[PDB]
Amino acid sequence: SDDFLWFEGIAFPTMGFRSETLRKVRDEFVIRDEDVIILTYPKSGTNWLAEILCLMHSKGDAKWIQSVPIWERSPWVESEIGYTALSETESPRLFSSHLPIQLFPKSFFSSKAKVIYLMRNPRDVLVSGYFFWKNMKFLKKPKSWEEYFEWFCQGTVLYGSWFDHIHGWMPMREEKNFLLLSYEELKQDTGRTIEKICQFLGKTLEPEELNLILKNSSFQSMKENKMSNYSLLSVDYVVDKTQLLRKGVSGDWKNHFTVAQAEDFDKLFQEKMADLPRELFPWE
Ligand SMILES: C[C@]12CC[C@H](O)CC1=CC[C@@H]1[C@@H]2CC[C@]2(C)C(=O)CC[C@@H]12
């Protein structure tokens, strides 16, 4: 209980999670063929993808993403609140999960449910998590940038190692009910990425309906919505509410790694990811 819940070799947050729900998640939760699920390692762009999916279902009309909080419109199945709400929700259901493949519901692998897996450059994921997690109460905090940098590459951080999460899920990449996307293609060509998603899910949008979704799904529009940027967390769970909105700390890895840290991280990545095709990863 040393500042985190330990379960099957993986660390989880202290507030909002319990050992028994995590066990029922694997052994008993029932997945349906009509469910749609967003899968990500934390801080890889979950909130932006969730906003786009709500907008496609509502044909571009936006008071929903402007009225309801992301954890209500796309709940995390492994948390208490999420598990409760989902277990009593009428199809179709839209939800999210950060779990690695060994802890995901057994029921899924016997289904036809559609999943979308989103990955991001791990240098930006490391920076974004450093600033976000060190600002949350009741969570084990690092004593310095250098110390967090070492935790991340050894794997002793929330939800485990980024290298193990990616290796576990990649073998599902050519299955019919699985779509692989990168944060980089989403930001460089949002419109082309929205079309890949509409084809995979198999729905049809009218011309004026696609125009509205395109208007409400821009990067800029995304960062300023209070329903999606986490700035609705109460003063009871945050250390300093004022820097929740700080800038230059949710990516921009070059402004934070020293030259020696970047050369050493390049060698580590090549070593660990050598058994997969290099061109699957669109970043230097
Ligand atoms: C919502 C969020 C933050 C965003 C993540 O994608 C999902 C998540 C899991 C546990 C939450 C955390 C916010 C901060 C919380 C509330 C803590 O301080 C402990 C539990 C933490």
Side-chain angles (χ1 to χ4, degrees), residues 155-168:
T156 49
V157 292
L158 300 164
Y159 285 93
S161 156
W162 178 96
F163 303 100
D164 291 353
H165 202 281
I166 294 286
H167 270 114

Side-chain angles (χ1 to χ4, degrees), residues 153-212:
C153 312
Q154 290 296 309
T156 49
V157 292
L158 300 164
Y159 285 93
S161 156
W162 178 96
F163 303 100
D164 291 353
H165 202 281
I166 294 286
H167 270 114
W169 285 105
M170 285 310 214
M172 302 257 321
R173 67 177 186 289
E174 288 186 348
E175 295 290 59
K176 273 168 177 172
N177 66 327
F178 187 103
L179 175 69
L180 176 59
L181 297 174
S182 71
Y183 182 92
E184 295 63 29
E185 76 187 295
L186 176 60
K187 184 172 185 165
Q188 179 269 45
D189 198 335
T190 319
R192 177 168 194 268
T193 303
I194 288 170
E195 121 172 54
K196 273 194 178 174
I197 295 163
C198 185
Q199 305 297 297
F200 170 76
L201 298 168
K203 70 185 296 98
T204 54
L205 296 164
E206 291 301 298
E208 300 182 53
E209 304 183 328
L210 182 60
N211 293 344
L212 188 56

Side-chain angles (χ1 to χ4, degrees), residues 36 38 49-57 94 116 197 201:
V36 175
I38 295 169
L49 183 54
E51 236 179 60
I52 290 156
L53 293 164
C54 181
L55 292 164
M56 298 185 38
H57 183 269
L94 172 68
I116 305 186
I197 295 163
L201 298 168

Side-chain angles (χ1 to χ4, degrees), residues 121-131 145-146 148-150 152-153 163 248 251-269 284:
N121 187 154
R123 300 157 183 83
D124 286 322
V125 172
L126 195 169
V127 170
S128 180
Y130 174 63
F131 289 106
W145 165 251
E146 286 78 13
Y148 188 77
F149 187 99
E150 195 182 331
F152 186 92
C153 312
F163 303 100
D252 306 299
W253 73 268
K254 289 182 178 179
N255 291 336
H256 298 280
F257 279 50
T258 62
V259 176
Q261 282 165 342
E263 291 176 0
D264 292 344
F265 194 88
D266 284 342
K267 295 168 198 227
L268 178 65
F269 187 100
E284 292 280 285

Side-chain angles (χ1 to χ4, degrees), residues 38 40 43-54 63-77 79 81-82 85-86 94-98 118 132 222 225-233:
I38 295 169
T40 62
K43 306 310 188 176
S44 300
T46 318
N47 65 356
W48 196 1
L49 183 54
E51 236 179 60
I52 290 156
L53 293 164
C54 181
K63 187 158 84 204
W64 291 115
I65 57 169
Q66 294 190 44
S67 119
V68 192
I70 187 172
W71 54 80
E72 306 207 313
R73 46 186 169 67
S74 197
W76 275 266
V77 63
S79 74
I81 292 158
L86 286 174
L94 172 68
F95 56 103
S96 303
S97 177
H98 293 314
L118 181 64
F132 190 82
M222 196 265 112
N225 182 170
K226 63 177 165 200
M227 294 312 271
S228 307
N229 61 27
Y230 293 116
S231 62
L232 209 73
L233 287 188

Side-chain angles (χ1 to χ4, degrees), residues 31-43:
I31 298 280
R32 309 169 197 169
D33 289 340
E34 320 85 69
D35 291 336
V36 175
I37 316 165
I38 295 169
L39 302 174
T40 62
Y41 182 84
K43 306 310 188 176

Side-chain angles (χ1 to χ4, degrees), residues 205-242:
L205 296 164
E206 291 301 298
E208 300 182 53
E209 304 183 328
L210 182 60
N211 293 344
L212 188 56
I213 292 153
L214 292 172
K215 275 259 163 191
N216 292 39
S217 72
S218 71
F219 180 61
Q220 316 60 275
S221 203
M222 196 265 112
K223 60 184 172 186
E224 290 166 23
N225 182 170
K226 63 177 165 200
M227 294 312 271
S228 307
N229 61 27
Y230 293 116
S231 62
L232 209 73
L233 287 188
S234 94
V235 86
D236 296 328
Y237 298 76
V238 171
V239 180
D240 172 9
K241 256 226 152 150
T242 65

